[PDB]
């Protein structure tokens, strides 16, 4: 669970950064 959690956030982060 931890590894997956972390990986989804790492991947998502920069996307959100481009829009807000």
Can you characterise this structure?
This protein is mainly alpha-helical. Helix content is 90%, strand content 0%. The protein has one helix and no strands. The protein has one helix at 2-19. It is rod-shaped. It is classed as antibiotic. The entry lists the keywords membrane active, peptide antibiotic.
List keywords for this structure.
20 residues, mainly alpha, 1 helix, 90% helix
Biggest sheet character: none
Q: How big is the Rg?
A: 9 Å
Proportion in helices: over 70%
Tally of individual helices = 1
How widely separated are the two ends? 28 Å
- Shape descriptor reads rod-shaped
- How many extended strands? 0
PDB class: antibiotic
Keywords: peptaibol, peptaibiotic, membrane active, peptide antibiotic, antibiotic
Assembly: monomeric
Entry title: Microheterogeneous Paracelsin-X from Trichoderma reesei
Short account of what is shown:
With 20 residues, the protein is mainly α. The protein is 90% helix and 0% strand.
How are the elements arranged and paired?
Elements: H1 2-19
PDB class: antibiotic
Keywords: peptaibol, antibiotic
Assembly: monomeric
């Amino acid at each position: 669970a931890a590894a997956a959690a972390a990986q989804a956030v790492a991947g998502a982060a920069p996307v959100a950064a481009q829009q807000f």
